[PDB]
Design a protein around this ligand. Structure first.
Ligand SMILES: CCCCCCCCCCCCCCCCCC(=O)OC[C@H](COP(=O)(O)O)OC(=O)CCCCCCCCCCCCCCCCC
Ligand SMILES: CCCCCCCCCCCCCCCCCC(=O)OC[C@H](COP(=O)(O)O)OC(=O)CCCCCCCCCCCCCCCCC
Ligand SMILES: CCCCCCCC(=O)OC[C@H](COP(=O)(O)O[C@@H]1[C@H](O)[C@H](O)[C@@H](OP(=O)(O)O)[C@H](OP(=O)(O)O)[C@H]1O)OC(=O)CCCCCCC
Ligand SMILES: COCC(CCO[C@H]1CC[C@@]2(C)C(=CC[C@H]3[C@@H]4C[C@@H]5O[C@]6(CC[C@@H](C)CO6)[C@@H](C)[C@@H]5[C@@]4(C)CC[C@@H]32)C1)COC
Ligand SMILES: COCC(CCO[C@H]1CC[C@@]2(C)C(=CC[C@H]3[C@@H]4C[C@@H]5O[C@]6(CC[C@@H](C)CO6)[C@@H](C)[C@@H]5[C@@]4(C)CC[C@@H]32)C1)COC
Ligand code: NA
Ligand code: NA
Lengths: 511, 149
């Protein structure tokens, strides 16, 4: 029910050995809570939740279990009453976890941050953040305490918080400037270059350089044999493909065919694969005779558009430039239907005009071009009334050519005054929902961004081939970032703080 | 050179009349609202510029494949794709109808990229900017009124 990474306490070899010759339980309310959750007893589970230690972890685990049971019951096509009664339990447990987190952060902040990161021995060594992410709980990760914890994990071991970013670029470009930044309590360089923010900025600078080289090679004349910049671009593409293959192989599932399915879940990955294959085909066709070389160059020119577009993924790290991109992504789906309707009207007008003006044309594929070309250009400003309805020294006028200006006028009135204004109204009246949803989704995906830049080779793709050599040499041979290991006294203090917080929460709610 | 600097200065001194206008009861808050919508517009200009640069580079590389390196290349990318979105969409200056020099290899992609670029720039981003201006106007209006008073 939990997931691939989870490992229950009963299935461990120690408990199998203990159970074979058949004691007690150190935390009985954990077992009773899981029993009540698994047997669809909501009141009993809510009673057992407020007793014992680790209330927030219990709430998140119960939420995940209820969601998984609801999904499985819906899949197994049982009575839909159960599959709708379980989702309510999941929502209730998620709300309890969110309220407990809010109370804990309201009381004390350092203990609240320590609560979300410390390793949980009873729940297969997973922190509260990982349990919340595995449960797809957006309201928990989007909370203020979770966002500040994510910012602390993203900044690395550097204490600069006023105006960052510029200093990171300075340190990347000027290594002597590194030994002037404050650090959290020789080895300073290793801690600087392993922070995820520095990795991200190094990757961004490498991508900017690669884009510049690609623009240079496509703009300037191309010869029989590739120049140096073309070789650099080809090496960048090859190493990026190798890095994508490495990301595929070291994924979460243990099956080679199954990891591909999980990797093909984000659209950026499949678009990257398509672009890399297209670039490989174009490069293969490029090193040939003149016509195939021209075809390869045209493939290069077409392919550069995608690498220009992919800068939005880089922009997505910004606080204000990410939600706008998600809003654009939703507005495209909102715009498709009006594109269809305008296409219908445009085709009608174009066919009518072409049939009226030119009545003695032999069948040719040029006819399919004259329908879409000029009616489409006529709605973006080029409404030249000399080309359409020609003034017919004087060639004879075509029969019925006085209808073309009237049809054009009606078509312009429909297309430029009605549909576009209705589209403006549609965009305007459905903006608040899209804005809130995009903000929540970006705040949730910040965690995945931080994780995927924390687990990444330090060198950018154009010279990442060297960092792939060390993974082969080390083949024959987490202090922080994910978890936080604490002693027994600190664990007891955290448990005391959590019990105080949950008691205060219940008392305040009753009052 | 001094005359050109005079022209730039007359641009600035013409702009500086909004400070004089700022004494009016209704012409001050509008200027402050302009000041904040400037930030929003500058946030959208980056995306518009990315799309524009992509289309310009693609068209320039497709149509002219035998150009020596010159700074004129950096001009042909920004000039015409920018003038296109302000109503000057042409069909003979760009995508030439190729008595006739031979057609360039792959010149049938320029009108399709042009159509997609116009659809993205003139129907999507500008309408989204209109929605952004419209849905965040009451807060800006109240704050500007308070700050002016
Ligand atoms: C299909 C790509 C093949 C590449 C080789 C040929 C490329 C030539 C045409 C370029 C087309 C590239 C568009 C790729 C966009 C898909 C990205 C995606 O799906 O992520 C969704 C992404 C979410 O995925 P998530 O990780 O699950 O959240 O949502 C977005 O951010 C969408 C907003 C960005 C798309 C706006 C730009 C698209 C219009 C460009 C039209 C071309 C103009 C030419 C002038
Ligand atoms: C940068 C100045 C150099 C001047 C010498 C060269 C000038 C050549 C270009 C002219 C640019 C002048 C724009 C100066 C505006 C800055 C004023 C300011 O910051 O006050 C903020 C001011 C607030 O300061 P406060 O006293 O703290 O409240 O807020 C505003 O009122 C902003 C609204 C006015 C700006 C809108 C006009 C700007 C676009 C003009 C583009 C040029 C068109 C050319 C055709
Ligand atoms: C070529 C770039 C293309 C990739 C662009 C990659 C995308 C990109 O642009 O980076 C975003 C990042 C901005 O975020 P950054 O951390 O630097 O600064 C934030 C900003 O100062 C806000 O004003 C702060 O408060 P608030 O929010 O107002 O309340 C916020 O504080 P907090 O809330 O965090 O505590 C700060 O985080 O960097 C820059 O743009 C600075 C110049 C660097 C870029 C200029 C140098 C090129
Ligand atoms: C008259 O002959 C000129 C000659 C000197 C020729 O040198 C050339 C060197 C390459 C260079 C600087 C030149 C023209 C286009 C320039 C491109 C414009 C691109 O714009 C950018 C624009 C913005 C970027 C995001 C994308 O690329 C560059 C990758 C690109 C760019 C700056 C690469 C550099 C190119 C001039 C004189 O010598 C005596
Ligand atoms: C140079 O000479 C060409 C010659 C071959 C000529 O064959 C012709 C056969 C009819 C055909 C395929 C041709 C041109 C217009 C084509 C129309 C375009 C229309 O578009 C569609 C567009 C979308 C639809 C919704 C509406 O109609 C078709 C009804 C229509 C359509 C596909 C019908 C088919 C027409 C070519 C070469 O032979 C050696
Ligand atoms: Na116009
Ligand atoms: Na015009």
């Amino acid at each position: 029910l939990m997931g691939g990474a989870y490992r229950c306490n009963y299935t461990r070899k120690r408990f199998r050995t203990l159970y074979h010759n058949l004691n007690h339980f150190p935390f009985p309310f954990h077992e009773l809570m899981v029993w009540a959750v698994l047997m669809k007893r909501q009141k009993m589970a809510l009673f057992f939740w407020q007793h014992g230690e680790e209330a927030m972890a219990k709430a998140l685990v119960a939420c995940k279990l209820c969601k998984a049971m609801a999904h499985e019951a819906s899949e197994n096509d049982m009575v839909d009453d159960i599959s709708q009664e379980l989702n309510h339990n999941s929502r209730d447990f998620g709300q309890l976890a969110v309220e407990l987190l809010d109370q804990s952060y309201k009381q004390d902040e350092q203990l609240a941050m320590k609560l979300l990161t410390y390793e949980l021995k009873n729940w297969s060594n997973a922190t509260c953040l990982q349990l919340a992410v595995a449960a797809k709980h957006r309201d928990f990760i989007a909370h203020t305490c979770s966002q500040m914890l994510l910012t602390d994990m993203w900044m690395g071991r550097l204490r600069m918080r006023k105006n960052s970013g510029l200093k990171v670029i300075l340190g990347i470009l000027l290594p002597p400037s590194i030994l002037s930044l404050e650090f959290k309590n020789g080895r300073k360089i290793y801690e600087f270059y392993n922070a995820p923010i520095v990795k991200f900025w190094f990757y961004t600078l490498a991508y900017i350089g690669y884009l510049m080289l690609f623009n240079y090679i496509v703009l300037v004349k191309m010869e029989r044999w590739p120049s140096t910049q073309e070789w650099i671009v080809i090496s960048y593409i090859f190493t990026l493909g190798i890095e994508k293959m490495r990301e595929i192989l070291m994924s979460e599932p243990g099956k080679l065919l199954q990891k591909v399915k999980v990797w093909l879940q984000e659209y950026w990955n499949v678009t990257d694969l398509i672009a890399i294959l297209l670039f490989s085909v174009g490069m293969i066709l490029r090193l040939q005779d003149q016509p195939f070389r021209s075809d390869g160059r045209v493939i290069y020119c077409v392919n550069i558009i995608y690498w220009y577009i992919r800068l939005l993924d880089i922009f997505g790290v910004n606080k204000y430039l990410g939600p706008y991109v998600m809003m654009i992504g939703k507005m495209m789906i909102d715009m498709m239907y009006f594109v269809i309707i305008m296409l219908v009207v445009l085709m009608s007008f174009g066919v009518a005009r072409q049939a009226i003006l030119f009545p003695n044309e032999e069948p040719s594929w040029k006819l399919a071009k004259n329908i879409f070309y000029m009616p489409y250009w006529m709605i973006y400003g080029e409404v030249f009334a000399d080309q359409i309805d020609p003034p017919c020294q004087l060639p004879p006028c075509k029969t019925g050519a006085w209808i073309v200006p009237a049809i054009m006028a009606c078509y312009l009135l429909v297309a430029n005054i009605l549909l576009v204004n209705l589209l403006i109204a549609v965009f305007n009246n459905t903006f608040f929902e899209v804005k809130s949803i995009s903000n929540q989704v970006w705040k949730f995906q910040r965690y995945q961004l931080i994780m995927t830049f924390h687990e990444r080779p330090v060198l950018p793709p154009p010279l990442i081939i060297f960092s792939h050599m060390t993974m082969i040499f080390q083949h024959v041979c987490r202090d922080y970032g994910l978890k936080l290991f604490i002693t027994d006294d600190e664990l007891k203090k955290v448990h005391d703080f959590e019990e105080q917080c949950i008691e205060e929460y219940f008392r305040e709610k009753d009052d």
